[PDB]
Every structure is written in C-alpha cells, then in structure tokens.
Amino acid sequence: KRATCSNGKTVGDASCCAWFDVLDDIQQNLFHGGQCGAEAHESIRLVFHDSIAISPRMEAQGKFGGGGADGSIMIFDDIETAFHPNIGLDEIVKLQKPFVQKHGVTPGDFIAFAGRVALSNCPGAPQMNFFTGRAPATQPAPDGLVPEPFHTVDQIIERVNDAGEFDELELVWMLSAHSVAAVNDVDPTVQGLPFDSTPGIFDSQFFVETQLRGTAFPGSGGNQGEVESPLPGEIRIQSDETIARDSRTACEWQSFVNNQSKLVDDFQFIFLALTQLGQDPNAMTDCSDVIPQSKPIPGNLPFSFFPAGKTIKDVEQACAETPFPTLTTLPGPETSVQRIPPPPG
Ligand code: HEB
Ligand SMILES: [Ca+2]
Numbered sequence: 229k230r231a232t233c234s235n236g237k238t239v240g241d242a243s244c245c246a247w248f249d250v251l252d253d254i255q256q257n258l259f260h261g262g263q264c265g266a267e268a269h270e271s272i273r274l275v276f277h278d279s280i281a282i283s284p285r286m287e288a289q290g291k292f293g294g295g296g297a298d299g300s301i302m303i304f305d306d307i308e309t310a311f312h313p314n315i316g317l318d319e320i321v322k323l324q325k326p327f328v329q330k331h332g333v334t335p336g337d338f339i340a341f342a343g344r345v346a347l348s349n350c351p352g353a354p355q356m357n358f359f360t361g362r363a364p365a366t367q368p369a370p371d372g373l374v375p376e377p378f379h380t381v382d383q384i385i386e387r388v389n390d391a392g393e394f395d396e397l398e399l400v401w402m403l404s405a406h407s408v409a410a411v412n413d414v415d416p417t418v419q420g421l422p423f424d425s426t427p428g429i430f431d432s433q434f435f436v437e438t439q440l441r442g443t444a445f446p447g448s449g450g451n452q453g454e455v456e457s458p459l460p461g462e463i464r465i466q467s468d469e470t471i472a473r474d475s476r477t478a479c480e481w482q483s484f485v486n487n488q489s490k491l492v493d494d495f496q497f498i499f500l501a502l503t504q505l506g507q508d509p510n511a512m513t514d515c516s517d518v519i520p521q522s523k524p525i526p527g528n529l530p531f532s533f534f535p536a537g538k539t540i541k542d543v544e545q546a547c548a549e550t551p552f553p554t555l556t557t558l559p560g561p562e563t564s565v566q567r568i569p570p571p572p573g
C-alpha cells in the first residue's frame with residue numbers, strides 16, 4: 229500500500245514525505261498564508277521560463293539547446309534572468325533560493341513544486357500534479373528560447389513545437405495561466421496590471437476579455453508588446469490579442485469560454501508536460517499527493533461572464549465554426565481592475 233510520513237500523512241512514495249515540510253514552509257513564508265497573489269503568480273511564470281528553454285532542433289545541429297525543467301534559471305540566475313524574456317524573474321528566483329538551500333531539494337524540483345502549490349492556492353485551479361527527478365543543470369540555457377509578447381504567432385507556434393512537440397492548440401491551453409497573472413515590466417509607469425479581471429481566480433475570464441475590442445491603454449502608450457485593452461487597469465499583450473483572433477487558434481481560444489471542465493483538464497495536462505521537459509517521465513516519481521486540494525470558485529456567478537459595461541456587441545468574433553456565447557453581463561459600472569503590487573524590495 230502506502231508510506232506513512234512522520235507528520236502522519238500517507239503517500240504513494242516514501243521520497244515524497246520531505247515535501248510536506250517544504251509545503252508548510254512556502255505556504256507560510258513565500259505565499260503569505262496560501263494566497264494566489266504576486267509570489268504565487270511569479271512562481272507559475274517561473275515554471276514556464278525554466279522549462280521551455282530546451283531545443284531538440286539545436287541539439288540535432290550539434291548546439292546545446294538547454295536542459296528544460298532542470299532548475300537552470302535559478303542555478304544560473306545571473307545569466308538567464310538577464311535575458312529580456314526573463315525580465316523581472318530574478319526577484320522570485322531570489323525569494324525561492326533560500327528554501328532550496330534549507331530543504332536540500334533540487335532547484336528544478338522546487339520550481340515545479342512551487343508552481344503547483346501556487347496554482348493550488350487559486351480557486352478554480354485543476355488538481356495539480358507534482359513529479360520529482362530533475363537533476364541540477366550544469367549549463368545555462370541559451371537565449372532566444374522564451375517567447376516574447378511582440379513575437380509573431382508563427383514564431384511562438386514554432387518555438388513550442390520545437391521545445392516540447394506542442395501543437396498550436398496546446399499553445400492556447402498553456403496560456404490559460406494568464407488567468408492568474410499580472411504584468412510588472414511592460415508598462416514602465418505601473419507594476420501589477422492583470423491580464424484578466426480575476427487574477428486571483430483560475431477561470432476563463434482571460435479568454436473572454438482578450439476577445440473584447442481594445443479601447444485604451446491602462447497606463448502609458450508606446451510600450452513594445454502592449455496593445456490596447458478593454459478595461460481600465462487590465463493590460464493586453466500583442467501575442468495574446470493575435471492568438472485570440474488567428475484562424476489557427478481562435479476556435480480553441482473561444483472553446484474555453486463557459487467551459488470550466490475543458491479549461492482545467494487541458495491545463496492540468498499541459499502544465500505537467502511543461503514540468504517534465506528535458507526529463508524521462510518514466511524515470512520520475514509521482515508526489516502529486518503532497519499538493520493541496522484545489523478549491524472551487526466561490527459565490528454565485530456563472531463560470532464565464534462579461535465584465536460590467538460589456539456585452540456581445542464588444543466582442544471581436546474570430547471563430548468561424550461557432551458564434552461567441554451570449555454571456556450574462558455583471559451588473560454595475562465598468563470597474564477598474566485593481567493592480568497586484570509585486571513583492572516589496
Ligand atoms: C506558466 C504558464 C505560462 C505560459 C505558458 C506563458 C506564456 C507566455 N507568456 Fe506569460 N505569464 C505567466 C505564465 C505563463 N506565460 C504568469 C503566471 C505571469 C504573471 C507573472 C506575475 O504575475 O508576476 C505571466 C506574465 C507574462 C508577461 C509579463 C511579464 C513581466 O512584465 O515581467 C509577459 C510579457 C508574458 C508573455 C507570455 C508570452 C509571449 C507567452 C507565449 C507562450 N507573460
Ligand atoms: Ca531550464
């Protein structure tokens with residue numbers, strides 16, 4: 229059957245027991261009592277920037293293409309966090325390092341762990357998986373491997389296809405993370421502008437809101453990779469805006485609107501896949517029973533809605549197969565999306 233940890237919990241594999249002490253430590257000292265706040269969002273982002281930096285095409289040509297989910301972004305933070313796509317990630321890397329040192333775990337395992345635990349904090353999240361077995365990187369990733377907000381949809385599709393054999397529909401899946409996300413470094417005048425009106429809730433509001441006609445910048449204009457957004461305080465990036473309207477991806481983008489089961493099943497899958505880049509999944513240990521049970525979305529709303537002051541008339545419909553769903557609109561005046569201030573220091 230199962231192993232029993234010193235704290236009296238039971239697990240599928242005895243090696244998983246050490247992660248309960250990591251869990252308690254980060255929930256209290258990294259995530260401010262298990263919150264879906266700035267440190268959680270940064271930890272989710274960090275998983276992608278560690279993991280996607282792998283390139284089988286470069287290896288085939290005799291060039292080191294990076295080791296994927298290997299902890300390189302932490303081990304070699306002075307190198308990798310100075311790459312422009314990794315802007316702002318040295319803060320979370322620095323917050324995470326003490327825990328890795330204290331608990332004697334691999335940097336790559338800890339990054340995957342912290343991302344899973346972060347998502348567990350966000351109502352609506354899938355039940356996140358956690359596998360161990362990522363040896364420390366011995367070489368930093370090359371630059372040019374992490375997508376930018378100003379890149380073409382073509383080059384982003386190509387990049388994820390190379391990194392993980394991900395198709396263009398799976399690209400849409402992994403962008404679900406922007407449902408619990410804010411932007412600190414794109415607008416030099418303001419930090420913490422969310423991508424959707426519910427950055428604390430893993431829902432499909434990101435997929436709704438990116439489909440709306442953009443009307444204004446939330447702060448300054450003229451920032452590379454930024455386009456007009458539909459709501460005060462919400463930011464929109466060019467890549468997301470284009471993927472939402474591109475004939476290859478627009479139908480998948482819309483499919484998440486008012487479809488919670490598809491959202492969570494697809495994201496659960498793709499997040500695990502990201503955390504196993506550069507690894508042999510058969511060689512890894514399943515420690516998924518350490519991750520907290522995800523919480524349902526509270527309250528009494530339909531799963532997807534238009535934000536207040538928006539209706540079907542504000543949607544730029546892009547899926548030729550299926551009209552955009554006629555959602556309910558939240559009552560009241562158009563409200564400003566509140567910023568998520570990044571960690572002090
Ligand atoms: C994980 C998963 C994921 C994925 C896949 C992604 C994908 C992406 N993305 Fe992301 N992001 C994210 C998650 C993510 N993401 C998050 C979580 C965030 C937030 C952070 C904070 O809040 O801090 C972001 C954020 C972000 C930002 C902001 C930053 C700064 O400012 O610093 C940007 C620009 C981006 C982009 C992007 C792109 C281009 C792509 C393509 C693919 N993003
Ligand atoms: Ca890496």
Ligand SMILES: [Ca+2]
Nearest residue numbers: 407426429431
């Ligand atoms: Ca959200």
